[PDB]
């Protein structure tokens, strides 16, 4: 699967909020472009002169994420974060010359990402009470991955001693994205677990944190809540459900060629971290069928 690479696979079936540290530092920002950031300003002016209702927004930037030695006590993950924007995204990751900016970063800084905005996404593998994952169909009229399958999520906007507030906002944001798009009550959702981090190579390597969330509603009830918002309550054009049993072999199905890269990330991490039993009981052939 060339369009998605794993940056992080969490241990212990996934990491809760209280085991994660963040360092939000201007040392983690994008480096100014070799010829100057005027080139980002020029793409933005052109875009606003066609679509003057567009507005900029701040984003978190992923620099790096370091996992503690497995089985250790204390914080298990450090996320190194800076700040970027929708505008810096449009002028770098989304630019036609994005591959040239990756080569320049390798040459200048020993870092393919040094000249890229790399805004941090969040996504969820959202399971129902009746053991299904939730999928959404993307509109055919949006700029990115039109008409493809997605999972719930988005790209949080800002606002360990500011770090903990930043971790809280990331975990809060995946639940808020589920309530905004799927139309579920907050109180039907578990606290998220972080499964890992996946990179979208079709979007010059920008990363998404992938989370596991359990809902107390059945697939039937989740569908009712989604539809009862009406065509204006969501950006997606449809919702559908796959049995957790069947997610295990999803990369062998015709669905796989219709998943956008960040949703492929979420399903691979679900399969490795929540799937893939290690013990004798869930390992036994009748519960883990071979092939
Ligand atoms: O947070 S972002 O900068 C906003 C962006 N939205 C999709 C999009 C794509 C191309 C042009 N406009 C919007 C995220 O994919 C990254």
Give yes or no for a contact between 164 and 203, defined as CB atoms under 8 angstroms apart: no
133: nearest Cα among 116, 152, 148, 114:
152
The verdict on residue 198 lying in a domain is: yes
The verdict on residue 157 lying in a domain is: yes
Phi (first) and psi of residue 222, to 5 degrees: -60, -50
Spatial distance between the Cα atoms of 247 and 21, rounded to a whole number of angstroms: 31
157 annotated binding-site participant: yes
**CA dihedral defined by 67, 68, 74, 79, rounded to 10 degrees?**
-30
**What is residue 278's three-state secondary structure?**
coil
Write the CB contacts of 231 (distance below 8 Å, at least 6 apart in sequence). Answer: none
The verdict on residue 129 lying in a domain is: yes
The verdict on residue 287 lying in a domain is: no
Spatial distance between the Cα atoms of 233 and 260, rounded to a whole number of angstroms: 22
Q: Can you read off the two tokens belonging to residue 57?
A: 């927004």
The verdict on residue 291 lying in a domain is: no
List the determination method. X-ray
Q: Please report the resolution in angstroms.
A: 2.0
76: nearest Cα among 162, 23, 15:
15
- Who lines ligand 1 at CB under 6 A? 59, 86, 89, 94, 119, 143-144, 155
Give yes or no for a contact between 290 and 235, defined as CB atoms under 8 angstroms apart: no
Spatial distance between the Cα atoms of 258 and 232, rounded to a whole number of angstroms: 24
CA 93 / ligand 1 centre spacing (Å): 10
177 annotated binding-site participant: yes
151: nearest Cα among 266, 6, 68, 256:
266
CA 280 / ligand 1 centre spacing (Å): 45
256: nearest Cα among 245, 244, 268:
268
The verdict on residue 282 lying in a domain is: no
Give yes or no for a contact between 183 and 226, defined as CB atoms under 8 angstroms apart: yes
Diameter of the chain measured on Cα atoms? 63
Domain count of the fold of the chain: 1
Give yes or no for a contact between 197 and 207, defined as CB atoms under 8 angstroms apart: yes
CA 274 / ligand 1 centre spacing (Å): 29
Spatial distance between the Cα atoms of 108 and 208, rounded to a whole number of angstroms: 25
Please report how the helices 163-182 and 219-228 are oriented relative to each other, as an axis angle in degrees rounded to 10: 80
86 annotated binding-site participant: yes
Spatial distance between the Cα atoms of 23 and 119, rounded to a whole number of angstroms: 16
The length of the chain, given as a count of residues? 291
Write the CB contacts of 99 (distance below 8 Å, at least 6 apart in sequence). Answer: 204
Domain that holds residue 41: 1-277
The verdict on residue 93 lying in a domain is: yes
The verdict on residue 290 lying in a domain is: no
Q: Could you report how far apart the first and last alpha carbons of the chain are, in Å?
A: 20
């Amino acid at each position: 699967d060339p369009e998605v690479t794993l940056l992080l696979q969490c241990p212990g079936g996934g990491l809760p909020q209280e085991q994660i540290q963040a360092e939000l530092s201007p040392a983690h920002d994008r480096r100014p472009l070799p010829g100057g950031d005027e080139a980002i300003t020029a793409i933005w002016e052109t875009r606003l002169k066609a679509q003057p209702w567009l507005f900029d927004a701040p984003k978190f930037r992923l620099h790096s994420a370091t996992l503690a030695p497995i089985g250790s006590r204390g914080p298990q993950l450090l996320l190194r974060l800076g700040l970027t924007s929708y505008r810096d995204f449009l002028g770098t990751n989304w630019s036609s010359s994005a591959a040239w900016l990756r080569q320049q970063g390798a040459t200048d800084w020993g870092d393919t990402q040094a000249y890229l905005a790399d805004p941090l996404g969040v996504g969820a593998a959202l399971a129902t009470a009746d053991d299904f994952l939730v999928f959404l169909r993307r509109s055919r009229q949006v700029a990115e991955a039109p008409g493809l399958v997605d999972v719930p999520g988005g790209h949080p906007e800002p606002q360990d001693l500011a770090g903990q507030l930043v971790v809280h906002e990331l975990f809060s944001s995946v639940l808020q994205e589920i309530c905004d798009e799927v139309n579920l009550p907050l109180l039907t959702l578990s606290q998220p677990l972080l499964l890992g981090i996946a990179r979208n190579e079709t979007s010059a390597g920008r990363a998404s944190a992938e989370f596991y969330v359990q809902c107390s509603l059945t697939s039937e009830q989740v569908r009712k809540h989604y539809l009862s918002g009406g065509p204006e309550a969501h950006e997606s054009t449809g919702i559908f459900f796959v049995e957790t049993q069947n997610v295990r072999r999803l990369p062998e199905t015709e669905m796989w060629a219709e998943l956008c890269p960040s949703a492929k990330g979420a399903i691979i991490l679900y399969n490795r971290v929540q799937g893939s039993p290690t013990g004798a009981a869930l390992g036994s052939p009748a519960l883990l069928p071979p092939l």
